[PDB]
C-alpha cells in the first residue's frame, strides 16, 4: 500500500498569486502514475493532470506539475478566484488506487 | 411423411412411399439405421462469431429429442455457460441421459452473458443440436455438441482440445468475444480466425512470455495485415 | 464527449441496502473502465470498488468486500451498485465515474492494451444517499 | 432421385458408433469390469463411393422437415420408436 | 354389434388434433419461428352419419375397463405402445 | 383385451378379436387412432357441487398415464388447487410433459381445502382424467383437465374463460362452495347453477355496484324463486 | 345454545411458542365468525386475530402479524390459534369467541350478508397460559 | 441345443405374474376401489416337466451376456421394447 | 443377438436365429415374454458374508433398466443403506417407478458403513439385481432386490420376515457383520448361519432375556460346536 | 382507529342504586355499532348490548342503553349485588374493532 | 503394545471448530472402544464422548452435546474428534483413549462381550489446542 | 450421578515413606468398578489399577489399593521420587463415567 501525504493543510494566498501543491508519497509510485484532481463542494472532482506531468483534457495553461519516485508537485501560476478549490492527489501505479486527504487552497 | 433413403449398393434412392417396390428388401431391423451428419459437412461457417448468429431464444414451445445410433467427427463442437445480467442462468440443465457429443477435435466452449429472452434456446435454421445418442432441438447448458441433422436410412443386405471464449451480449445481433489465453489474458476475437490460429497464438504468447503478470488484464489485438493460417 | 447520469437522492433504514444506477451517455460502454467512489461529508473521496463490462466482471475495495455487488447490462448502458449493510455511517455521496485502459507492450502479433483501475475523467452528478430511521 | 444441391460436400465420411462386437475377454461385458463411456465406441472411415455420401448429406437436409413437424405434433419428450415405425409401416404396404 | 345404451349421446363431434400439413411458408416447420402450443392444433366438426358417433361414444364407454386393467399390470409410467402393438397383432393374426 | 373399433365407412363396428376377417385392411399405422371423448357427452351432470362427488381419494395405488391423438372440445373443464388444513398440498405438482386440455368453453377453477386421506385423487367410475395429450388416472395440481374415455379405433382406407370458485371440505360428502365475484364478494353456489347463470350474475354484480366495498366479505344469497338460465 | 370448549392451562419457555385449542361444539362451524382475544391481569380484553372458517382465511392485529397464526378444521369443529415469539409479557388469559353475520343490502337476486368480526355472543371459559422458565 | 451345465438346478418354479383376468366384480378394475399395488400379482407352481425348468435356467444364464451389449449400446434409461423388436424380427425374417 | 427361448411343449430349445424354422409359430404378442429367474436357483451362496462379495464400486458406466413381466419367489432378498464415513450416501435414491421385489421369505436388511470408491454398486459377474418388474444394472438405495437373470421365450400356442444386520467396511474385501437382535443387542454374524438360524437365536434370546437391559452393548458369539440348523 | 374512553373509572353506589355508565368516541361509530359487556373476575366478558341499543339474549330487562356519534351510555336501572362488575364498551361500525379501558361498579 | 498417535498442536479463532485426529497403530480397531477427554490447565481430565466404531456409533458427554462430533474411518485407522463453538474457556489438551470389553454373561449359545466406555489402557500423547484472536 | 471426591488435597511425605490415597463416592460403585491413574505434567495419566483391586499392566508391585460400596483406597508401600503424580480415582461402574478432582503427592 502506497500512502500519500498532501500538504500544507491550507494554503492561503490572495487572488492572482502562484500556488504550490505538494504530495509525498510512503513508496515510490511506479511508472509516476500519479493524478491530481480539482474538487468544488457539492461536485465530483475534476481530472487536472495525470502520469505525474500529463495535462488533462480541457485544462487551462495556468495548471502544470512535476513528479517522480515518492515527490509530486501540483502548481497554478497565477490562482484564479475559480480555483481556489480542494486538491487531491492519486496513484494508480500500484492497486489498489489510494489517495491523500486533500489540501485547500483559501483566499488571503 | 419422414422420408427413407435406400442403399442398394452404393446406389442411394429416395424411398418411394407409395409405390410397393418388390425389389426392396428389408430382413430385419438392423439394417434400419439413424444416422447423424454435421453441417460442418455442408460447408457452414464455424467460427464463434458466426455460428451464435444461427441460433437465438424462444418462449412458448417445449423441446424435443429423437435418438441417433451412428454420426460423425466433429471438427467444430460448442459448449455454452450463458447467464443473465443478474446472475440468472438462460440455459436449462441438461436433464440425465445427456451426455456430451463423443468425438470433437476442437471444443468451442463459451462463457459469458446476455439478454435471453425466451424459455429455450433453439436453432433458427431448424437444425438439431447433437448431443452423444440424442438429437435435440434446443441448448442443454453446459453440455458438448455438435449442430447437425438425421437421415433414416435402409441398409445394403481420443485426444481432444478446448479452446476458450468470453463474452457479452450472447443473444444479441451486437455482441463481442474475447479469446482467452490465461485468467488476465485475452485475445479480441476476429472472424477470420480459425482453431489453428488460436492455438498458434496461445503458444506464441506463453512461449513469449508476454501475458499479463499484474493485477489487471490485458487484451491483444490482432494486426490486421499478419494473416492466420 | 461522454457523461455519466445518476439516479437522485435515497434514503434507507439501517439494515437494508441502497441501490445506484449510472447511465453511460454520449458514447456507448466500448471498453471502458467503470468504478464507484464514496464521499462521506468532510472526508476525501474513497475508491469502493469497479466493474470492466467487456469481462462482466467486478471487484471491491476490502472494507466492502461482501457488502457491495457492481453489475452491468449492455443493453441499457447502464451500471448499477449496491451497498448493503447500511449504517448511518454510510450517509455520503456516491459518484460513478470512467476512465480509458492504458497502452501496454507491442509484439510482432499486435498491440495490447491494459485493464485496470485508473484515473477518471468522466464523472457523475453523484448520489445522495441518507441512512435513517 | 437425390438432387444434391448443397453449396459443398465434404466427400469423407468419419464415423462412430456402439455397434460393436462387445465379446472378447469373457468379462468384457460386465459393466463393472468393462470401459468407462467414452470408450465405447469404435469408429471407421467410408469414402463417397458412387456418390453415397454426397446423397447421404442432402438426404439427411430434406428429412429434417419432415422430421421436425413430426415431432411437433407429438407429447413424447424423448421419441425412440421412429425405425419401428418404420418397420410396420413397410410390412403393412407389403402385406 | 354395438349396444349403444348411454343415457344420453351428443351426436355432434367438435374435435381438435395436431395432425395438420404443418409446412406452408418454409419457416412453419422451425420450431424458432413456428407458433406457440396452444396454436399447433387443428380442428372442425363430424356429423353423426349412420349412427358413427353415438357408436364411438359407446366404444370408448367399454374400452375403458380393458384399458383400465391393462395399465394396472404394467410398469411404464406413461405408454404410448398400444397402438403399435396392435399394428402387430394384427399382422400376426394374419401372417 | 382392449377392443379395437373398425370403421368400413360410416359403419362402425366392434373387432372380433378371434376372427381373422379377410375383409379388414390396415395400409399403414396412420389409420390407427387414439382418440379421447368427454363424459359431458353421455350426459353426466357437470356442475361443480355434483362433478367432485365422482372424485376421491386413495392411497397405496401408482398413476398411470396413455397418449391421444385427438379428441373433442369441452364446454366443462376443471382445475383444481386443494390444500390441507395445515397448508400441505393435497395434488401432486405435475410432471413435465404434462400440460392443460388445449380447448375448454369454460374452466371451473376451484381452490381451497380439505381432508385429503390417500396419495392421489382417482376417479370414482373409472374415467381418466385429459390433458393436453394425455389421460391419467390421477388428479395434477394445477392443470386444467377434462373427464373422459379412450377409444382405438381403425379409420377407413381461441377464447375461453375462467368461473372460480372456493370451497371447504373438498375431499368429503358434506362441502361448501362460493362463486368469487371479486375478492371480497361470493355468492352461495346452488347445484341448479350453469356457467351461464353465473356469468350474468358476475355482470349483473359489477354493473349494479353490489360488491364489497369495505373490509369484510359479503356473500350473496340467490333468492330461489328467480329461476336460472 | 353454541358453546366454546377451549384447553387447559400450559406453560412454555421464552423463545417457543404455544398452540390453544377451541372447539365448536352445541351446533357447528355453519357460516360463524372466530376470533381470538388477550387479557394479561389488571389489563382489559384486546383482539389478537381471527378466522372465518367457510372461507378458509385468517387475519391479525397489527401487533401480532408474524407472530399469529389462526387455523380451523371442519372435521373436528375446531379452531386453533397459534402465538411465537413468547416471553414472559405475553402471560394472559387467552379465550376463542364466536358471534354472527351481519345482515346486509338487498337486492332482486336475494339478500347479502356481511362477515368481518363483530360482536362475540358466545365465549369459552379462557386458557390460561404462562411463559416462564 | 441346451447345454445345461450349471453345478446345481432347482426344479421347482413358484413364479409370480400380473397377467390375472382382473375383471370379476365391476369395480375390481377401477383404481380408487382395487386392490393395492402389493396385492396384484397371481401365483402358481410348475413342475419341471421334461426338463423344461433347468433348461429355462441355462436360457436365461446364456442371455446374460448378449443382454448386457445390447443395453451397454443404447441411450434409453429402460427398455420396454425388446420383446416388440422380437416380433418385428420374427415377422420380416418369414416375410 | 438376444437368444430366444422356444417351447414346443415341455420341450426347450434355444431358436434358430438365421434359420427359417417355418415350424415356429406366434399368433399373438402375448406369448412373448420377459420372465426374471434368481440366481439362488443355481445354488450360489446367499449368506450375507458371501453374497456382498459379488458386489462392487464402478465409476464412468451410466445404469440401465430392462422390464420384465414374470418371475419367481426368492428366498432370499437383499436392502442396502450403506453410507460413507463422513455420513454420505453410497448408493443413489431410486428413482420413481422402482419398487421392491414382490415375494421374499426373508430380507437381509443391511444397514452400514463403508469405502464407496465408484457412483454406483454393479454385480460383478454381470448379474441383474430385481427390482419389482425391473431388472436393473445397479443397486438402489432403500429398496429390496434379488439377484438373476432374464430370458426371454416363446410360450406354447404375503407374510415375510425380516433380518436385519449392521456392517462396517462394506465396500471392501474385510469387512465385519453383526446380527441385530435389539438396538443393544448383537450377535457376531458368522458365515455358516442360515435364515432359519438365526431366526431361531432372537427367539432365544428375547425368551431367555439376556439381552443388554444397560446403557452399552452386547455382542454374543456363538460357540463353534453347537451346528446351526 | 375509533379511540373509546369510558368514565368514571369506579362508581360507588350502594346496592339498588341506578348505575349510569359513560362512553366516548375520539371518532363518530358507524351505524352507532357499539356494544357493552359485562365481566366477572375468572370469566370471559358477557354480551349485554350491541348496535348501541339492541339487548343481548338472556339479559334482563333492568339493563339499557342508548347512543349514537361518539356518545354512548350504558345503565342499569337497580344494580343488583350480581352485577358489581366490570363494564367494556367495544366498538365494531369501523374496523379494527377497539374498545375502552373498562369501568368498574363498586359496592357503596 | 498398542499405541496412539495424535496430531500436532493448533490456535482456532473464536466461532470455529477444531479437529483432531488419533491414529490407531500398534494394532487395528479391531473391538476396542475408542474415547477423548479434555484437560485445561489446572483442571482434572474429563470424558467429552467417545465412539465405538465396530457399531459406527459414537455419544457425548451433555456439556458436549451439540458441539462435538466423532468419527472413525477404518481404512486409514483413525478417529478424528470435532469440537465446535470454539471460545478461549475451550483452551485444553485433548486426548485420545483405548480401551478393552468386559466380559459378560455367559449361556449355551456362546459368550458375551459388552461395549461401553470404561477404564483407558493406551493413551495419546495430546494435543494441545488454543482458542484466541 | 456418582460424585467421586479424593483427599487429602495433598500428601506430604519423604521419598521411601508408604502413600495412602483415599477416595469416596456419593453412591455405590456397581462391581466395584473404580479405576485410578498416575499423572505427571505434560503426560496422558496412566492406568494403576481398575474394578477397585486389580493391578493394571506393567505396574509394578509397589502398587496396591481395594475398595467396596463407597470407599476406595490406594496406596503405595515406599513412594519413589518417579511416583511423586496427581492421582485420579474414576468410576465406570455406572454411565457416564465419573471421576474425582484429584490429589497430588507431594515431597517433605
Ligand atoms: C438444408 O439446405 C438448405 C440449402 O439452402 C438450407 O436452407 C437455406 O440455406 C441458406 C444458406 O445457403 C439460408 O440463406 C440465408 O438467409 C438469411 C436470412 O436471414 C434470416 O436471419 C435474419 C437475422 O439475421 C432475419 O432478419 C431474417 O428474417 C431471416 O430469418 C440471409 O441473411 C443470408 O444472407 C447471407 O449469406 C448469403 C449466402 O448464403 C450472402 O449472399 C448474403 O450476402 C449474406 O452474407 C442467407 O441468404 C436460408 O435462410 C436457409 N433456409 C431456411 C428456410 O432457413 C437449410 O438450412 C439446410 N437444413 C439444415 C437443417 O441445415
Ligand atoms: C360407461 O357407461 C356406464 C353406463 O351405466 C357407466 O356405469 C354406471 O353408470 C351409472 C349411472 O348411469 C352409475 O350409477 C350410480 O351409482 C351410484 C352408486 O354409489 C357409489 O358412490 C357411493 C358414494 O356416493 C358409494 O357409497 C357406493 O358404494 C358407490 O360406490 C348411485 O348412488 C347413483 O344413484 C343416483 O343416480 C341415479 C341415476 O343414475 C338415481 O336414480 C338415484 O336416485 C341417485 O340420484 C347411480 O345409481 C354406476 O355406478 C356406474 N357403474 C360403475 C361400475 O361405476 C360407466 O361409469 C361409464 N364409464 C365411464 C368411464 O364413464
Ligand atoms: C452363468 O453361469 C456361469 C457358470 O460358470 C457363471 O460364470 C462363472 O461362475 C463361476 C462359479 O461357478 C465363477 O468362478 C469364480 O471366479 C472367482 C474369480 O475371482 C474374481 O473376483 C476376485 C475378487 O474376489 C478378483 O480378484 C478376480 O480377478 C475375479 O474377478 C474365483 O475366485 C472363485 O473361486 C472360489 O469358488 C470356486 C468354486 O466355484 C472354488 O473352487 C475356489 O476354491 C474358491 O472358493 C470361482 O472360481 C466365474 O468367475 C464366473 N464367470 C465370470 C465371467 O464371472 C455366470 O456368472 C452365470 N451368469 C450369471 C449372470 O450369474
Ligand atoms: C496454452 O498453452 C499452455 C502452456 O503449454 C497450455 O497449458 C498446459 O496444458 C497441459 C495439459 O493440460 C498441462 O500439462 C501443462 O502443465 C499446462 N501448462 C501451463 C503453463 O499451465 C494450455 O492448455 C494452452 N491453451 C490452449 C487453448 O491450447
Ligand atoms: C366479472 O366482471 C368483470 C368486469 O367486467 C370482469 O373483469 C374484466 O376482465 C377483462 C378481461 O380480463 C379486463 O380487461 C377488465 O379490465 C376487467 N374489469 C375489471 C373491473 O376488473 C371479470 O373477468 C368477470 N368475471 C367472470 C367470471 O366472468
Ligand atoms: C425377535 O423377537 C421379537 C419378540 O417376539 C420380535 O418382535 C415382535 O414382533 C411382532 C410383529 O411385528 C410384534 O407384534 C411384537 O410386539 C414384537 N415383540 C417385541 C418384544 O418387540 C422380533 O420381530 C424378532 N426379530 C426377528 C428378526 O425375527
Ligand atoms: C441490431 O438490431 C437493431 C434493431 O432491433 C438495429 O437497430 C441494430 O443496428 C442491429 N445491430 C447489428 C450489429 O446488426
Ligand atoms: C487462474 O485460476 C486458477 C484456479 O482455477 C489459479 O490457481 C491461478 O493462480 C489463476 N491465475 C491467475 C493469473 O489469476
Ligand atoms: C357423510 O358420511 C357420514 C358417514 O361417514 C354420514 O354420517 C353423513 O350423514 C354423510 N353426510 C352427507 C352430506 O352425506
Ligand atoms: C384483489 O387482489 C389484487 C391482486 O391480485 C389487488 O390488486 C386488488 O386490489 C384486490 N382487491 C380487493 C377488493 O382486495
Ligand atoms: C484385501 O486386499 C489387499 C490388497 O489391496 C490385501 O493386502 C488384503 O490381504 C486383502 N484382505 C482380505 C481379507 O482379503
Ligand atoms: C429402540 O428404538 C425405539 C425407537 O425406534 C425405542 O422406542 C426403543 O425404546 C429403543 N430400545 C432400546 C433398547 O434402546
Same mark, same amino acid.
Given at each position: ?14 487572488p492572482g498569486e ?12 511506479s ?5 491530481? +484532481? ?12 495525470y ?7 480541457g ?5 502544470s506539475?512535476?513528479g ?11 490562482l ?11 496513484? +494508480? ?16 | 411423411?419422414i422420408?427413407?433413403?435406400?442403399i ?6 429416395? %424411398? ?52 441417433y445410433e ?10 455454452l ?7 440468472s ?19 468451442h ?6 439478454p ?18 440424442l438429437? %435435440? ?22 485426444? %481432444? ?10 443473444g444479441?445481433?451486437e ?17 477470420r ?6 492455438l ?24 490486421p495485415e499478419?494473416?492466420?493460417? | ?18 441501490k445506484v444506477?449510472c447511465?453511460?451517455?454520449?458514447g456507448?460502454?466500448?471498453?471502458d473502465?467503470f468504478?464507484?467512489?464514496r ?25 466492502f ?19 448493503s ?7 455520503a ?9 492504458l ?26 444517499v441518507?441512512?435513517?430511521? | 432421385?437425390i ?9 469423407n465420411?468419419?464415423?462412430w ?7 472378447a475377454i ?7 469390469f ?20 454426397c446423397?447421404?448429406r ?29 418397420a ?8
Amino acid at each position: 500500500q502506497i500512502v500519500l501525504t498532501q500538504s500544507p493543510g491550507t494554503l492561503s494566498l490572495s487572488p492572482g498569486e502562484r500556488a504550490t501543491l505538494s504530495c509525498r508519497a510512503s513508496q515510490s509510485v511506479s511508472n509516476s502514475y500519479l493524478a491530481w +484532481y480539482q474538487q468544488k463542494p457539492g461536485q465530483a472532482p475534476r481530472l487536472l493532470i495525470y502520469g505525474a506531468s500529463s495535462r488533462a483534457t480541457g485544462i487551462p495553461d495556468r495548471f502544470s506539475g512535476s513528479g517522480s519516485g515518492t515527490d509530486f508537485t501540483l502548481s497554478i501560476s497565477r490562482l484564479e478566484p475559480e480555483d481556489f478549490a480542494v486538491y487531491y492527489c492519486q496513484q +494508480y501505479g500500484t492497486s489498489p488506487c489510494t489517495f491523500g486527504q486533500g489540501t485547500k487552497l483559501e483566499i488571503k | 411423411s419422414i422420408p427413407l433413403g435406400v442403399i442398394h449398393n452404393s446406389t442411394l434412392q429416395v %424411398s418411394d412411399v407409395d409405390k410397393l417396390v418388390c425389389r426392396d428388401k428389408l430382413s430385419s431391423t438392423n439394417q434400419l439405421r439413424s444416422v447423424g451428419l454435421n453441417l460442418e459437412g455442408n460447408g457452414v461457417a464455424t467460427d464463434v462469431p458466426s455460428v451464435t448468429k444461427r441460433w437465438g431464444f424462444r418462449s412458448g414451445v417445449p423441446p424435443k429429442v429423437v435418438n441417433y445410433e451412428a454420426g460423425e467427427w466433429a471438427e467444430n463442437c460448442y459448449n455454452l455457460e450463458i447467464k443473465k445480467p443478474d446472475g440468472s442462468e438462460c440455459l436449462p440443465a441438461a436433464p440425465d441421459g445427456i451426455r456430451g457429443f463423443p468425438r470433437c477435435r476442437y471444443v468451442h466452449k463459451v462463457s459469458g452473458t446476455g439478454p435471453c429472452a425466451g424459455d429455450f434456446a433453439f436453432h433458427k435454421e431448424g437444425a438439431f443440436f447433437l448431443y452423444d445418442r440424442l438429437a %435435440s432441438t434446443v441448448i442443454y447448458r453446459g453440455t458438448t455438441f455438435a449442430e447437425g441433422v438425421v437421415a433414416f436410412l435402409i441398409l445394403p443386405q481420443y485426444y %481432444s482440445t478446448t479452446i476458450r471464449y468470453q463474452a457479452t451480449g450472447f443473444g444479441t445481433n451486437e455482441t463481442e468475444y474475447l479469446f482467452e489465453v490465461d485468467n488476465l489474458t485475452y485475445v479480441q476475437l476476429e472472424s477470420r480466425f480459425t482453431p489453428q490460429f488460436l492455438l498458434q497464438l496461445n503458444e506464441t504468447i506463453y512461449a513469449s512470455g508476454k501475458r499479463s503478470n499484474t493485477t489487471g488484464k490485458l487484451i491483444w489485438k490482432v494486426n490486421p495485415e499478419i494473416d492466420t493460417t | 464527449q461522454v457523461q455519466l447520469v445518476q439516479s437522485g437522492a435515497e434514503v434507507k433504514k439501517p439494515g437494508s441496502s441502497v441501490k445506484v444506477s449510472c447511465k453511460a451517455s454520449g458514447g456507448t460502454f466500448s471498453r471502458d473502465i467503470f468504478s464507484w467512489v464514496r464521499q462521506a461529508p468532510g472526508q476525501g473521496l474513497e475508491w469502493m470498488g469497479g466493474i470492466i463490462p467487456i469481462f462482466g466482471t467486478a471487484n471491491y475495495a476490502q472494507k466492502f468486500q461482501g457488502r457491495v455487488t457492481i453489475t452491468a447490462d449492455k443493453s441499457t448502458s447502464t451500471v448499477f451498485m449496491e451497498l448493503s449493510g447500511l449504517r448511518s455511517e454510510d450517509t455520503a455521496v456516491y459518484f460513478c465515474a470512467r476512465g480509458p485502459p492504458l497502452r501496454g507492450e507491442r509484439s510482432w502479433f499486435g498491440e495490447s492494451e491494459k485493464y485496470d483501475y485508473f484515473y477518471m475523467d468522466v464523472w457523475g452528478k453523484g448520489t445522495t444517499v441518507t441512512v435513517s430511521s | 432421385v437425390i438432387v444434391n444441391a448443397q453449396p459443398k460436400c465434404n466427400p469423407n465420411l468419419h464415423y462412430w458408433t456402439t455397434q460393436d462386437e462387445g465379446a472378447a475377454i469373457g468379462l468384457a461385458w460386465i459393466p463393472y469390469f468393462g470401459p468407462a463411456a467414452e470408450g465405447i465406441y469404435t469408429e471407421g472411415l467410408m469414402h463417397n463411393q458412387d456418390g453415397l455420401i454426397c446423397g447421404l448429406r442432402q438426404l439427411a437436409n430434406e428429412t429434417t422437415q419432415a422430421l421436425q413437424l413430426f415431432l411437433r405434433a407429438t407429447t413424447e419428450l424423448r421419441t425412440f420408436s421412429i425405425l419401428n415405425r418404420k418397420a410396420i409401416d413397410f410390412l403393412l404396404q407389403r402385406w
